[PDB]
Amino acid sequence: MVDFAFELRKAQDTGKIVMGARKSIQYAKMGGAKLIIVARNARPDIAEDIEYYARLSGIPVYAFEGTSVELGTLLGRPHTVSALAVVDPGESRILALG
């Protein structure tokens, strides 16, 4: 079983993650993310856009069971994060969530 918070942080530290709806959609759109993570309270249209662009490319989407406040904190930020994209997992097992 995958340790979300550990592996998310491990991927943030040893790989490449981009944060926020805009960059998530962008990396989804262009085929450059290997995984998209979305907080439970992402704006419904932003969540549906991600889902859409993700399904176009066959990129898995993971629904973080938690708010954008919790997700932002997990990524070490003092502000909300409604979505993020794992471009490079580094040494982490985060892509196993897919």
Author numbering: 0 to 97
Give the text the authors published on this PDB structure:
We have selected two salt-bridges (E6/R92 and K46/E62), which are located on opposite sides of T. celer L30e. The crystal structures of the E6A/R92A, K46A/E62A, and E90A/R92A variants were determined at resolution ranging from 1.8 to 2.0 Å. The root-mean-square deviations (r.m.s.d.) between Cα atoms of the wild-type L30e and its variants were <0.5 Å, suggesting there were no major structural change in these variants. The values of ΔΔGint were in the range of 1.9–3.6 kJ mol−1 for the pairs of charged residues (E6/R92 and E62/K46) involved in salt-bridges. The average values of ΔΔGint for the salt-bridges E6/R92 and E62/K46 were 2.3±0.3 and 3.9±0.3, respectively, while the value for the control pair was 0.6±0.3 kJ mol−1. Compared to the wild-type value of 5.3 kJ mol−1 K−1, ΔCp were increased to 5.7–6.8 kJ mol−1 K−1 for substitutions (E6A, E62A, K46A/M, R92A/M) that break a salt-bridge interaction. For substitutions (E6A, K46A, E62A, R92A) that break a salt-bridge, the ΔCp values were increased to 4.6–4.9 kJ mol−1 K−1. In contrast, for the cycles, E6A/R92A(M) and E62A/K46A(M), that involves breakage of a salt-bridge, values of ΔΔCp(int) were from −0.8 to −1.0 kJ mol−1 K−1. For the double-mutant cycles involving the breakage of a salt-bridge, the values of ΔΔCp(int) were −0.8±0.4 and −0.9±0.5 kJ mol−1 K−1 for E6A/R92A and E62A/K46A, respectively. For the double-mutant cycles that break a salt-bridge (i.e. E6/R92 and E62/K46), negative values of ΔΔCp(int) suggest that the pair-wise interaction of the salt-bridges reduces the ΔCp by 0.8 to 1.0 kJ mol−1 K−1.
For example, we have shown that the thermophilic ribosomal protein L30e from Thermococcus celer has a ΔCp value of ∼5 kJ mol−1 K−1, which is much smaller than the value of ∼10 kJ mol−1 K−1 obtained for the mesophilic L30e from yeast. To study the contribution of charge-charge interactions to the thermostability and the reduced ΔCp of thermophilic proteins, our group had systematically removed 26 surface charges on T. celer L30e by single charge-to-alanine substitutions. We used the double-mutant cycle to investigate the effect of pair-wise interaction of two salt bridges (E6/R92 and E62/K46) on protein thermostability and ΔCp. Since thermophilic proteins tend to have more salt-bridges than their mesophilic homologs, our observation that salt-bridge reduces ΔCp may provide a general mechanism for enhancing thermostability - thermophilic proteins have more stabilizing salt-bridges that reduce the ΔCp, leading to the up-shifting and broadening of the protein stability curve.
